[PDB]
Design an enzyme around this catalytic site. Structure first.
Site, mmCIF file in Angstrom:
data_model
loop_
_atom_site.group_PDB
_atom_site.id
_atom_site.type_symbol
_atom_site.label_atom_id
_atom_site.label_comp_id
_atom_site.label_asym_id
_atom_site.label_seq_id
_atom_site.Cartn_x
_atom_site.Cartn_y
_atom_site.Cartn_z
ATOM 1 N N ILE A 87 0.514 -1.162 0.254
ATOM 2 C CA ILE A 87 0.209 -0.070 -0.062
ATOM 3 C C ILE A 87 0.954 1.258 -0.147
ATOM 4 O O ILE A 87 0.299 2.064 -0.553
ATOM 5 C CB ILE A 87 -1.188 0.062 0.985
ATOM 6 C CG1 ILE A 87 -2.287 -0.907 1.353
ATOM 7 C CG2 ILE A 87 -2.167 1.411 1.222
ATOM 8 C CD1 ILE A 87 -3.321 -0.939 2.086
ATOM 9 N N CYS A 88 1.770 1.461 0.669
ATOM 10 C CA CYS A 88 2.791 2.516 0.997
ATOM 11 C C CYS A 88 3.077 2.602 -0.832
ATOM 12 O O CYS A 88 3.677 3.935 -1.051
ATOM 13 C CB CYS A 88 3.336 2.525 1.554
ATOM 14 S SG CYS A 88 3.469 1.613 3.490
ATOM 15 N N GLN A 89 3.976 1.256 -1.093
ATOM 16 C CA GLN A 89 4.792 1.750 -2.611
ATOM 17 C C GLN A 89 3.086 1.973 -3.204
ATOM 18 O O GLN A 89 4.139 2.974 -4.411
ATOM 19 C CB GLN A 89 5.149 0.316 -2.776
ATOM 20 C CG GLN A 89 5.306 0.471 -4.404
ATOM 21 C CD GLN A 89 6.892 0.603 -4.247
ATOM 22 O OE1 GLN A 89 8.445 -0.118 -3.885
ATOM 23 N NE2 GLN A 89 7.597 1.729 -4.885
ATOM 24 N N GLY A 90 2.278 1.401 -3.340
ATOM 25 C CA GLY A 90 1.199 2.401 -4.156
ATOM 26 C C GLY A 90 1.160 3.963 -3.749
ATOM 27 O O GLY A 90 0.948 4.489 -4.924
ATOM 28 N N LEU A 150 3.249 5.995 -3.188
ATOM 29 C CA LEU A 150 3.995 6.714 -3.422
ATOM 30 C C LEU A 150 4.399 6.903 -4.369
ATOM 31 O O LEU A 150 4.849 8.362 -4.884
ATOM 32 C CB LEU A 150 5.507 6.685 -2.368
ATOM 33 C CG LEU A 150 5.729 7.366 -0.929
ATOM 34 C CD1 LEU A 150 4.461 7.023 0.253
ATOM 35 C CD2 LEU A 150 7.505 7.169 -0.713
#
Lengths: 153, 153
Positions: free
Chosen positions: A45-48, A50
């Site tokens: 989710i963090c990758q998505g 950012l």
């Protein structure tokens, strides 16, 4: 416990992915600042989130606005993650003391040891003008971020 | 201070890079355990030390011995680092509480928020039979590790 609109944004001095010191007060008088707290480098989710910030960077980093991501990881983690993902905005380390800045903004998950998905917009006087906090399993609506920055141009 | 030879190794339960639980006590009666504390994923000296361990893994992970790397990073950091480096041994997360296991063994760097280069060999009865601690800027001599394990077969 999330700091709300109208509060002074707690000043911080944190290391970015290049181990360079970044201070929130450095932006006073010059730019509105988007603070993107998030749980952990190299998670989905963090990758998505950012990745979406990266993909729309001109909306967030420009003559009027700056964007800073903040997480509990140390600079070497953030450096690898940023280089591999093409993140060129600052990723700041809330690493030691662990979660201190996240705590000051009221967005630290004390049970898990990570920031929640807290987002703030800080105006040119250092006051919080937008504030939200989602859970680690949720995804934020970045339209609210651009709507908020546009009100302060 | 670093725990000394003769002491009972403090028990711990930590997550590995796959978020599976690893306990020290699990190895009692079966294997000698090499505990390799180290500062940080994706840093130069740590990479060199774990790459050397990787290149000689059958000397450390076999019918008589197990090897566990321990650092303050969370599992997603260690998963990416292990995948990109070809590490198949366990990397354990001393993440939250931050450095607690490292502190129990007396090898935490309180100033920097990382484990120092602490190494222990725990025998099949849970007693520390080898103990060292180098600084983050130093490199360990892995001959001492293989020698320590060889004494306990």
């Amino acid at each position: 416990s999330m700091l709300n609109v109208g509060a002074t944004a707690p000043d911080f001095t944190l290391r970015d992915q290049n181990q360079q010191l970044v201070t929130l007060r450095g932006y006073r008088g010059a730019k509105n600042v988007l603070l993107v707290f998030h749980p952990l480098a190299f998670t989905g989710i963090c990758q998505g989130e950012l990745d979406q910030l990266r993909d729309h960077l001109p909306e967030f980093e420009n003559d009027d606005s700056a964007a800073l991501a903040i997480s509990v990881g140390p600079p070497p983690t953030h450096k690898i993650w940023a280089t591999q993902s093409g993140f060129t905005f600052p990723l700041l380390s809330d690493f030691w003391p662990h979660g201190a800045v996240s705590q000051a903004y009221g967005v630290f998950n004390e049970q898990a040891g990570i920031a929640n998905r807290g987002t703030f917009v800080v105006d040119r006087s250092g006051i919080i003008r937008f504030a939200e906090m989602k859970q680690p399993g949720e995804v934020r609506d970045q339209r609210l971020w651009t709507d908020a920055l546009a009100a302060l141009t």
